[PDB]
Design an enzyme around this catalytic site. Sequence first.
Site, PDB file in Angstrom:
ATOM      1  N   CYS A  65       0.839  -1.335   0.032  1.00 12.99           N
ATOM      2  CA  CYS A  65      -0.047   0.154   0.123  1.00 12.99           C
ATOM      3  C   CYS A  65       0.853   1.134  -0.001  1.00 12.99           C
ATOM      4  O   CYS A  65       1.999   1.273   0.585  1.00 12.99           O
ATOM      5  CB  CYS A  65      -0.837  -0.021   1.287  1.00 12.99           C
ATOM      6  SG  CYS A  65      -1.454  -1.545   1.741  1.00 12.99           S
ATOM      7  N   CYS A 106       1.997   0.111  -5.871  1.00 12.48           N
ATOM      8  CA  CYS A 106       2.989   1.396  -5.893  1.00 12.48           C
ATOM      9  C   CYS A 106       3.045   2.102  -7.093  1.00 12.48           C
ATOM     10  O   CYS A 106       3.905   3.085  -7.329  1.00 12.48           O
ATOM     11  CB  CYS A 106       4.109   0.930  -5.168  1.00 12.48           C
ATOM     12  SG  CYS A 106       3.943  -0.069  -3.711  1.00 12.48           S
TER      13      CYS A 106
END
Length: 131
Positions: A8, A80
């Site tokens: 995340c 990402c």
Amino acid sequence: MKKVMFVCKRNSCRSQMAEGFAKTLGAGKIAVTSCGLESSRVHPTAIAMMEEVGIDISGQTSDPIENFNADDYDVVISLCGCGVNLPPEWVTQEIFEDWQLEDPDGQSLEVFRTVRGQVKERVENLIAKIS
């Protein structure tokens, strides 16, 4: 079971949600986890959008990527922006993807709903490969 990861960045609700759908949809087929929580905490607006579909992402919490070992997760899903220099163990896995998806940052409910929905299809696709 096959071990899975969801990495995340930004409002990590999008990528921890990917784990929330993946524990839901991958249940008894995979073992699934998330890391990074760049929003420093979870975001109650995402929890509400997941409660809107009977899922929980409030019990999830921060744990950094550097403490993980993709060598121990057969399938790894970065989010990402497919532009982060993950260690090479993140590549040797059965799956290595980066769902470079939308950013709900601090948006309207509609983006918290929409990003969730688009993530759920990517989650379910990953599941369709493995489960």
